Amino acid sequence: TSQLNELVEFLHSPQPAVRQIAIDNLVGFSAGPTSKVFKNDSYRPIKDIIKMIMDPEHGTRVIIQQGVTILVNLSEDKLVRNIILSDDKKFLKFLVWKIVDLTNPNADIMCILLSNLAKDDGILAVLNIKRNSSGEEVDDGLKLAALNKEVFKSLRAMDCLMDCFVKGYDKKLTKYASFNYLAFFFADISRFKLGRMYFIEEQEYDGVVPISKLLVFTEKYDAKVRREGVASTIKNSLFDSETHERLLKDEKINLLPYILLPIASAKDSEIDEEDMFNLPDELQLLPEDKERDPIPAIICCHLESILLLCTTHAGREYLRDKSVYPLVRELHKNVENEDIGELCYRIVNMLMRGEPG
Ligand SMILES: [Cl-]
C-alpha cells in the first residue's frame, strides 16, 4: 500500500463522514512499519485523531475506540507520547475523566493508553487534575460527565482513578472494564518523586494512605497484570529509606504481610515453631493449598522491596522480628531460580549486619 499520506490528511477534513472513513481505514495501519505515516507533518495525524476523540458531537463509541487503539499502538514512541501529553493539555484531562465515567465502554483501552503515557514525566500533571464539582461540568471546552457520587467522593482525578482500580476489579463497577492496567499506570508514575509521594501520604478525601489500598492485590492470582503493577508500585514507594520506619510501623497500612505472602508457602517451608510465632498474623495458619507467586519477576520485585527495607537498622530490626529471614531462607531452598537466589542472599547479607557506629 503506497499513498497512505493522502489518506491520513482526511483526518482533518471538515466533513465528519470523511473523517469517519479515513480513521476506519487507518487503524489497521497503526501497527507495524506503516505506522510511520502518523508522524507526517510534525505528527499532525495524531493531533487530528486526538481532536476526533474529544469531539463531543462526533466522537462516537467506534471512533473513540479506533482512535484510542491507534494512539495505544503509536504510544510506544517517546516522541508520540510527548505530543499526546503536551501539545494539547486538555486531552489528559479528557482521558482520565472518561476512564472514571462508568458508562464509558472504551475505559479499559484508555487505561492502557494512560499506562503507556505514564512513562513520560509529563504524566505528573494528573496529580493536579481536579474538578470544581461533581455533576456535569464544562472545563476548557471539555464536557465532563457527572461523577457517580456514591463511589467517587473526591474531585481529584488521581483519587478517582484509585477508586476505579480498588473497587472496579472483576467488573464490579462496570460491565465494560476491570481497570487492570491502572496497575501499570500506578507503577510508572510512582517512579517519580511526586508520584511516590501520593502513594505514601494520607489523602484528604478518605483519610487513607493510598499504597495500603493496593496491598490486597498481591495475591490476586487471576490477574497477573494487577500483581505485577502493584508489586512495582510498592517497590517504588519505598525508594526513600527515611520513610521506612513510619510505613512499617503504621498498623493502618500493615505493609509487610502483603509483601511476604507471595513468597510464603504451606507445602515446601520448614520453619521452627518459635520462628512461626513471630510471623505476622496474616502469615500464620495458612491454608493447605497456599503457594508462592509462580512468576519469578514478581517475586524478585517483592524481594527488591524487602531488600530496600533492609537499608536502615530500624528496618532490619523490624524485619528480623517478623521472621523475614526464615521466610527468605525457605524461598531460597525451594525455588531454584538464580535471580531469586541471588536476591535471597543479598537480603541475608543485610539482615546479618548489626547496628552502625
Ligand atoms: Cl491479567
From Swiss-Prot:
Domain of life: Eukaryota
InterPro entries per record: ARM-type_fold, Hgh1, Protein_HGH1_C, Protein_HGH1_N
UniProt entry tagged with the keyword Flavoprotein: no
GO molecular-function terms, A-Z: translation elongation factor binding
Keyword field: Acetylation
One GO CC term, this protein: nucleus
Sequence positions bearing N-acetylthreonine: 1
GO biological process terms on file: chaperone-mediated protein folding
Additional detail: Present with 20800 molecules/cell in log phase SD medium.
Family named by the database record: Belongs to the HGH1 family.
Protein name, UniProt field: Protein HGH1
Organism from which the protein derives: Saccharomyces cerevisiae (strain ATCC 204508 / S288c) (Baker's yeast)
